[PDB]
Amino acid sequence: SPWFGMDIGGTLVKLSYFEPIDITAEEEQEEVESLKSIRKYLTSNVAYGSTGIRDVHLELKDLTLFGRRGNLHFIRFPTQDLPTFIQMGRDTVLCATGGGAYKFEKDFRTIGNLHLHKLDELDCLVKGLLYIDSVSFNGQAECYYFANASEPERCQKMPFNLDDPYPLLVVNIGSGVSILAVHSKDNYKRVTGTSLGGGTFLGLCSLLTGCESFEEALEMASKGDSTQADKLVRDIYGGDYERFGLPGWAVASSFGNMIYKEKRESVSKEDLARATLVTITNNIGSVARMCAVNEKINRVVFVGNFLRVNTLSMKLLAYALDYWSKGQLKALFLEHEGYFGAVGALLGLPNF
Amino acid sequence: SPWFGMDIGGTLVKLSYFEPIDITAEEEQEEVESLKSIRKYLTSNVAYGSTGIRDVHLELKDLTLFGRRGNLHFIRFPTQDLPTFIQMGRDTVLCATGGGAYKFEKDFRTIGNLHLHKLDELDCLVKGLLYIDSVSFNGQAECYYFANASEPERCQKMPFNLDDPYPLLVVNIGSGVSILAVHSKDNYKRVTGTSLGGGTFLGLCSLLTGCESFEEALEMASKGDSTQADKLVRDIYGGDYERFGLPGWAVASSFGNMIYKEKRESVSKEDLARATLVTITNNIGSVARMCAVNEKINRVVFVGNFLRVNTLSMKLLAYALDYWSKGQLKALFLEHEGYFGAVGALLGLPNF
Ligand SMILES: Nc1ncnc2c1ncn2[C@@H]1O[C@H](COP(=O)(O)OP(=O)(O)NP(=O)(O)O)[C@@H](O)[C@H]1O
Ligand SMILES: Nc1ncnc2c1ncn2[C@@H]1O[C@H](COP(=O)(O)OP(=O)(O)NP(=O)(O)O)[C@@H](O)[C@H]1O
Ligand SMILES: CS(=O)(=O)Nc1ccc(CC(=O)N2CCN(c3ccc(C#N)nn3)CC2)cc1
Ligand SMILES: CS(=O)(=O)Nc1ccc(CC(=O)N2CCN(c3ccc(C#N)nn3)CC2)cc1
Ligand SMILES: [Mg+2]
Ligand SMILES: [Mg+2]
């Protein structure tokens, strides 16, 4: 059977697919036409139907996995479209994680003789994260940070070594937010979570602006001015609040200027999109900072698909974590940020 | 001069006024007509102009302050209307705190010979809180909690003794949120803050529902179902997430169901108001819980005017703090929750 790892989240399904590249002439004969059809379908297309996408730039080439060489592919589609995926599959050992491994268990079992093995969402995240970092991103660093995040003329993406990754605070920004403290490969805890996550950004953005997609929400936010909607320290004090080191530019009340009817009538959709992004991102950074201080961990890695093609939020996290921690915490980012659960599920295959 | 304490916040001005009740016959003669006019104006009206309100139920009767007996009155009006207040004053030693003591300093100085003494917002909060608790609420407890907050058939307001109040975590929910750790009467720190506060509730509520007042926002929220807008754990897992003790009813993504166009088209304004209230309140409780664990403090008192006439948020905080802390933290509430800064400012008068 094909080697697949699936993470069915509240919003997106993430799929890792291992394509063998060391197929012998004899093995090619013993391949059934459906298996050959699957491999060619997945490797000859980058869009699958109307909503599936292969993230070609993330492909790991010539990986040795389970004693065979191949390429590891990364594919995503909305959980709303899982019925289409299952229906395509009805006309294999599936290691699956995420909440949908439980919610849609009976649906996967409509595929005759399919064996479904449910694996824990956070166990898979930790295993997949450690694995991808260990094999590298085709010889490049999987982990990076923004150097000199305080100075914009100098702020630049730089590689970060995670050879001894422990301890590590993992902030998983998906529909909601989970925060993990990782002390060893077999010792980790879910410290807490917050419900102000990627789904809050997209849901509030759609309500406030009428945007119809995540990418559209980000494009609006890139054009907006969040201070048209937010009430800042300087709006309350006239300047800094010096006694407690709060700069005038800090947000005192997110959307707090929207209590005034005249300001609601002048704010643009782009301003509201940016205020939503800033509100959600700052809250995540602040919760991450409190968890790091309590866990006595100084390396904070942010994963999940809220940060896909979202440099605004990454730069805001990098700057805010460094600024508000007075340089004691560092924001770390991973190239394969949305796919670690799917990889960890795939890695569970030898157990079964 | 009249004895007044003023806290000029980002949204509301809070005023504490001490009315002497031991005026002798000779003192009444030496009272200038303007002073008599002020005292009679304040004590014979409960509404001042179109936006000032005296909270008569909070009055402290027959208090001994600065060696005189009198009644302590509590008055509020929007900071937007401070120009009207100052203009009324132009046709006294003023101890003032809050950001507006700085922002509007030059405006207060347009009142001839007025001496303005700016006092720190959080120093005044701590001093006023400790003072009011010490003198009691006309012989009743100033501090209360909700007993058996987990069981609704039993949940009831009960008094709480703060005779030895230290240590104490104070969560001040105003326009934004400040969190204080109080170790003694002269030893306290601002632990952190969040910008998701009362102004976020009111601003987002107005954008989403068109409500025109705080009280209207709360009335809408009392009629709504937040789960029409929020994505719950059971929407993602089909039930509880047992491995990490997350019940199916917990919110996984605030407004997370609003990523679906069909759900945006069926949600009511009341549902959105309630989802806004729940989102903001849960975030405040969660940040409070993390700060309490880090500060090693188990008593968490919530103040500020976000909780005025807001039993929904108080009960949600009481339940959530107890539930998510597994009974280790207790949510405490104070009858004079919005006025402690104004009282603390008044208490600074003997310094000058
Ligand atoms: N193409 C997209 N469609 C939808 N959401 C996207 C997309 N791209 C990025 N996002 C963001 O990614 C978030 C989902 O991230 P993801 O890590 O895949 O969550 P999930 O695993 O599906 N949810 P969860 O059950 O909470 O773990 C959304 O809330 C958006 O903020
Ligand atoms: N009549 C009202 N008008 C406006 N807001 C109200 C009213 N009643 C209650 N509120 C709530 O009270 C919050 C303001 O609380 P308050 O403690 O007075 O803040 P503030 O001191 O003015 N702000 P801050 O500068 O951050 O300390 C608002 O954000 C609302 O959520
Ligand atoms: C006194 S007031 O009247 O001006 N009102 C007032 C109320 C609340 C605030 C907010 C606040 O305190 N903060 C501090 C820490 N914050 C962050 C952000 C990102 C990261 C990361 N990574 N960490 N911490 C956010 C904002 C300010 C003023
Ligand atoms: C795994 S998932 O896919 O289901 N996604 C997922 C993501 C985030 C969450 C949220 C979460 O973890 N929590 C825990 C603690 N929370 C509170 C609330 C109030 C108080 C107080 N006082 N304290 N803590 C809020 C919600 C849940 C699921
Ligand atoms: Mg996920
Ligand atoms: Mg205040």
**Contact of B188 with A242, CB cutoff 8 Å:** no
> How was this structure obtained?
X-ray
CA angle A16, A20, A22 (to 5 degrees): 160
* A329 shares contact with chain B (CB less than 8 Å): no
Q: Scan residues 112-131 of A and list those with Cβ closer than 8 Å to B.
A: 120, 122
Return the closest-CA partner of residue B55 out of B89, B7, B16. B16
Return the DSSP state at A328. S
| Minimum-distance ligand 4 atom for the alpha carbon of A9 | 3
**Contact of A86 with A111, CB cutoff 8 Å:** yes
Chain centroid to CA A170: 11
Return the closest-CA partner of residue A304 out of A184, A220, A193, A178. A178
Q: Which residues partner with A117 through β-bridges?
A: A95
Beta-strand runs (E) in chain B? 3-8, 12-20, 47-48, 52-54, 60-65, 68-78, 93-97, 115-118, 143-147, 156-159, 168-173, 177-184, 187-194, 231-232, 251-253, 299-303, 330-334
Question: How far does residue A174's CA lie from ligand 5's centre (Å)?
Answer: 5
Return the closest-CA partner of residue B258 out of A173, A281, A78, A211. A211
Residues 6+ apart with CB under 8 A from A269: A208, A209, A210, A211, A220, A224
Residues 6+ apart with CB under 8 A from B227: none
**Contact of B298 with B246, CB cutoff 8 Å:** no
Cis status of the peptide bond prior to B20, with omega within 30 of 0: no
Active-site position among A121, A142, A295, A337: A121
Query: Where exactly are the structural domains of chain B?
Result: 1-140+339-352, 141-224+268-338, 225-267
Residue nearest to atom 3 of ligand 3 (CA): B99
CA angle B111, B113, B117 (to 5 degrees): 85
For residues B321 and B279, what is the distance between their CA atoms, to the nearest angstrom?
14
Q: Report the first-to-last Cα separation within chain B, whole angstroms.
A: 13
**Contact of B35 with B62, CB cutoff 8 Å:** no
CA angle B93, B97, B98 (to 5 degrees): 150
Q: How many CB atoms lie within 10 A of CB A141?
A: 16
State the DSSP string of A114-166: PEEEE--HHHHHHHHHHHHHHH-BTTB-SEEEEETTT-TTT-EEEE---SS--
Residue nearest to atom 6 of ligand 4 (CA): B252
Could you tell me the resolution of this structure in angstroms?
1.8
Q: Which helix (H) or strand (E) holds A289?
A: helix A269-295
Q: How many CB atoms lie within 10 A of CB B152?
A: 9
Return the closest-CA partner of residue A289 out of A205, A166, A194, A200. A194
CB of residue A201 inside a 6 A radius of ligand 1? yes
**Contact of A161 with B283, CB cutoff 8 Å:** no
Total count of residues recorded for chain A: 352
